Design a protein around this ligand. Structure first.
Ligand code: NI
Length: 374
C-alpha cells in the first residue's frame, strides 16, 4: 500500500496558502490515478507542525516508522524543508518540497530523496530579470529586508541582472517590522532607476505599494516591481493598492483552460482558488503516483530514476523535467496585478505577461550547484 503524508501549517500564517488546501490538492491527484496505487487504495495522512522544525521531524519520523508513510508533500518553511531533506536521506523516503523555495533542495544539498517540485529562489530571480530586461527595464533599485532572505535575494539579483546586461543603481535594507517606508522610497526615486524592486511580501510590501503612491510612483520613468507571487497578499491588500506590480510564479489559477479546470475542482473542496504551493503539491503527488504505477514499485530509488526520464506536462507543471539532482525545471511566468476596475470576480488578480522557458528560468545544467548534475 502507498501512504502519502501532507506535512504543513494549518494553524498559523501559512494555513491559507498551504494547510488544508494542500491536503485537498493531494486528494485531487489521488483522484487523477483512480484512487489507487499498486492495486490498493492510496492512504493519505496530514499533520500541523505549527512551523516548528522539531515538531515536523518528530511527526515525519513516526509517520515513516509507524504509519507506513512512503512520500511526504508540502513543507512550508525553507528551514524545515532543509531538515526534512536531511531526514529522508537517512530514512530512504521521498520528500516533495512543494511549499518552500530553498535552492539547496535539489541543489547543494541534493541527495536523491529530497525533491524540489515548486520552484527555487534562483528561478524567481531569473524569471523577473529576463522578463523585465526584455521589456526594457535595464536599471534597478533594490529594497530588501535585513534578514537572510534579503541577503539571498540581493546576491541572486545582482548576479543574474549583470549576466543579462542590466545594472543595479542602488539598494537599501529595512529593519524588521518597519511601518514607515518613506525614507526608502525617497532613495529609490532619487536613484533614477527604471525599476524599483520591492523584494519582500507581507505587510512590508503592502505598505511599500501604498506609500509609493504618495511619491508619484509609478511615474513615466520609474515602475515599482516585485519578486514572489503571494496571492493571499493581493487578497488582503486589494488591487487598488497592488495594481501594476509584477511577480514571478510557477502557477496561476486563471492562466489557461487547463489551470481553470484544476482550479474549479479545487474550489469545490476549499471555497477559494489554489495557490502555486497547493498546485505544486497536486503535481508532485500526481507524478509520484503515476511513477509508482508505471514501474509497479514504490521503491524510492526506482521512482526517482524513472521520474528523471519523463517530460512533465500536467495542469500545473509545464515543460517540466527532473534534473539528475532532484530539482524540477519548468516554464515560469511573470504575472501583473490588474487594475481594480478590471477585476471581474473574487481572485481575478493577474494577467500573465511573460513566459520564460525551463533552461532560461532555471539556468543550464552546468550552472547547477548539485554534484549529481555534473
Ligand atoms: Ni511545448
Amino acid at each position: 500500500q502507498v501512504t502519502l503524508g501532507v506535512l504543513t501549517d494549518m494553524s498559523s500564517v501559512y494555513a491559507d496558502s498551504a494547510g488544508k488546501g494542500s491536503v485537498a490538492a493531494v486528494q485531487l491527484a489521488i483522484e487523477d490515478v483512480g484512487g489507487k496505487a499498486l492495486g490498493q487504495p492510496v492512504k493519505l495522512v496530514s499533520a500541523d507542525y505549527q512551523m516548528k522544525t522539531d515538531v515536523a521531524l518528530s511527526i515525519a519520523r513516526e509517520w515513516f516508522d509507524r504509519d507506513g508513510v512512503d512520500a511526504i508533500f508540502d513543507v512550508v518553511n525553507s528551514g524545515t524543508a532543509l531538515a526534512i531533506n536531511n531526514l529522508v536521506k537517512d530514512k530512504k523516503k521521498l520528500a516533495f518540497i512543494t511549499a518552500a523555495a530553498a535552492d539547496q533542495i535539489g541543489g547543494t544539498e541534493c541527495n536523491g530523496y529530497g525533491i524540489g517540485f515548486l520552484y527555487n529562489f534562483t528561478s524567481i530571480v531569473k524569471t523577473v530579470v529576463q522578463a523585465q530586461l526584455a521589456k526594457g527595464y535595464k536599471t534597478w533599485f533594490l529594497m530588501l529586508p535585513d534578514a537572510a532572505y534579503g541577503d539571498l535575494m540581493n546576491a541572486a539579483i545582482r548576479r543574474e541582472l549583470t549576466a543579462g546586461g542590466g545594472q543595479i543603481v542602488g539598494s537599501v535594507r529595512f529593519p524588521f517590522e518597519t511601518q514607515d517606508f518613506s525614507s526608502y522610497l525617497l532613495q529609490a526615486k532619487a536613484s533614477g532607476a527604471q525599476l524599483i524592486v520591492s523584494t519582500s511580501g507581507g505587510a512590508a510590501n503592502i505598505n511599500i505599494m501604498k506609500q509609493a503612491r504618495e511619491f508619484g510612483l509609478p511615474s513615466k520613468t520609474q515602475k515599482v516591481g516585485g519578486m514572489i507571487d503571494i496571492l493571499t497578499d493581493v487578497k488582503s491588500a486589494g488591487l487598488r493598492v497592488m495594481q501594476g506590480q509584477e511577480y514571478a510564479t510557477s502557477f496561476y489559477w486563471n492562466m489557461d483552460d487547463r489551470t481553470r479546470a484544476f482550479a474549479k475542482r479545487f474550489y469545490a473542496k476549499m471555497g477559494k482558488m489554489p495557490t502555486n504551493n497547493q498546485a505544486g503539491g497536486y503535481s508532485a503527488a500526481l507524478q509520484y503516483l503515476k511513477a509508482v504505477n508505471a514501474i509497479g514499485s514504490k521503491d524510492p530509488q526506482k521512482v526517482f530514476a524513472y521520474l528523471k526520464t519523463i517530460k512533465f506536462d500536467d495542469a500545473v507543471t509545464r515543460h517540466g523535467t527532473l534534473r539528475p539532482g532532484g530539482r524540477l525545471v519548468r516554464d515560469m511566468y511573470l504575472v501583473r496585478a490588474k487594475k481594480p476596475e478590471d477585476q471581474k470576480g473574487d481572485w481575478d488578480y493577474y494577467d500573465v505577461v511573460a513566459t520564460i522557458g525551463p533552461e532560461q528560468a532555471f539556468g543550464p545544467l552546468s550552472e547547477s550547484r548539485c554534484a549529481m548534475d555534473k
